[PDB]
Amino acid sequence: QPGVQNFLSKQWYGEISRDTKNWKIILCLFIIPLVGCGLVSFRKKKKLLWYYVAFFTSPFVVFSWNVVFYIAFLLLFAYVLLMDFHSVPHTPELILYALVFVLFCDEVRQWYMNGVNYFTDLWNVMDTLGLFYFIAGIVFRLHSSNKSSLYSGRVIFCLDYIIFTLRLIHIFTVSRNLGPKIIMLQRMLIDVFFFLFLFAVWMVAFGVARQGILRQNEQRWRWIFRSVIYEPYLAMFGQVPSDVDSTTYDFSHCTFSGNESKPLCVELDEHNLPRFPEWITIPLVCIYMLSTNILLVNLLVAMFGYTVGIVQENNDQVWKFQRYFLVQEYCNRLNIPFPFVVFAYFYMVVKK
């Protein structure tokens, strides 16, 4: 209802007036000197000190600052990972370690405030997994003598980066223009699962048949799974499943026995010609492609359309309900900027 939304909005904007436009406040955020001017109307309860102190306490500005810091951390992580990586870490890597340490301290605070109910949320699990992967990567990387450990640590860090990057979707669910659309993604899992089920059934059938009627006694799991599954799956977007169904183009890539790393050859006949008939292979591939590429995708499109039409009206109140949690959680903390938070906790143990 409007009353609770207005209360939450007023609490979120803090002292700043709700009527102040967003772009003005953002611009003022980048350049601090305009805080003491008419750029933004506080409309809230010597003068310069109060004007400044109140500005760095509203959760809005803290959230924006944390977003900027997260983006900078991501940029530094990428640069270090794919542009400067050596056996002995350099200063930028140490700075990255410090940033990860402060993030870990924040996560420890989150653990302390809540209990086992904390782990029921999915993003929390993702964050914990990312932190553990980062720690494992450090452990592997510190072995400078052996190179394989360095490569393994680099791979671990790359996967951890993949995990970290997706958090932008979660932290941007409050834009008021994208958040409602992000929320509705939770309601389209069943259609995807049904599509995957049908696709897998057809894929398995076609791959098994084609491998059976062409090649004999592979006895190599790698190429077995490469031919049975990979190529039919690839056929779903674009390329025809196989260029081997036609006898016109073939050979020069075969391997009698498994000496080399190439697919096993098609068995020959007494006269050294291909033995498989085309009048059954070609219709099979045509039918498979028609069934998979076209009908299934269009069906998925139709189901997505119906689901969107059904759930669009209901999505909004769910979005507001989610907005409430954000506002409350941000209002709970001390609202100190993220980089300078570490000092605060420093004295908590002293004071507690």
**Bind-site residues for Ca(2+):** 107, 110, 124, 127
Q: Which residues contact 254 (CB under 8 A, 6 or more apart)?
A: 262, 263, 264, 265, 266
Could you tell me the CA-to-CA distances from 50 to 63, 100, 264 in Å, in that order? Answer: 21, 33, 79
Question: Is residue 350 close enough to count as binding its own copies by CB under 8 A?
Answer: no
Say if CB 25 and CB 34 are below 8 A apart.
no
Number of Cβ atoms within 10 Å of the Cβ of 180: 17
Write the interaction track for its own copies spanning residues 33-72; mark x where CB under 8 A is met and - where it is not: ----------------------------------------
Tell me the binding residues: 107, 110, 124, 127
Say if CB 14 and CB 64 are below 8 A apart.
no
- Which of 186, 239, 314, 317 is in the footprint of ligand Y01 by CB under 6 A? 186
Stretch that binds its own copies, among 114-122, 131-139, 209-217, 334-342 (CB under 8 A): 209-217
Question: Is residue 123 close enough to count as binding its own copies by CB under 8 A?
Answer: no
Distance CA 235, CA 247 (A): 20
Q: Is the CB of 105 or the CB of 297 nearer to ligand Y01?
A: 297
Residue type, 130: G
Could you tell me the two tokens for 308? 């969107």
Which one of ligand Y01, its own copies, none is in contact with 129 (Cβ closer than 5 to 8 A by kind)?
none
The helices-and-strands tally (H runs, E runs) of the chain is: 15, 0
Stretch that binds ligand Y01, among 226-234, 252-260, 307-315, 337-345 (CB under 6 A): 226-234
Question: Is residue 326 close enough to count as binding its own copies by CB under 8 A?
Answer: yes
Question: Is residue 327 close enough to count as binding ligand Y01 by CB under 6 A?
Answer: no
Q: Is the CB of 92 or the CB of 345 nearer to ligand Y01?
A: 92
- Residue (of 320, 337, 241) closest to 282 by Cα position: 241
Phi, psi dihedral angles at 168 (to 5 degrees): -60, -35
Question: Is residue 169 close enough to count as binding its own copies by CB under 8 A?
Answer: yes
Q: Is the CB of 153 or the CB of 207 nearer to ligand Y01?
A: 207
- Scan residues 266-325 and list those touching ligand Y01 (CB under 6 A): 277-279, 282-283, 286-287, 290-291, 295-296
Question: Is residue 125 close enough to count as binding its own copies by CB under 8 A?
Answer: no
Which one of its own copies, ligand Y01, none is in contact with 229 (Cβ closer than 5 to 8 A by kind)?
ligand Y01
Distance CA 59, CA 11 (A): 9
SS (H, E, C) 215-265: CCCCCCHHHHHHHHHHHHHHCCCCCCCCCCCCCCCCCCCCCCCCCCCCCCC
Q: How far is CA 257 from the centre of its chain?
A: 43
Which residues contact ligand Y01 by CB under 6 A?
22, 26, 64, 67-68, 71, 75, 78, 166, 168-170, 173-178, 182-183, 185-186, 192, 197-198, 200-202, 204, 208, 222, 225-226, 228-230, 233, 277-279, 282-283, 286-287, 290-291, 295-296
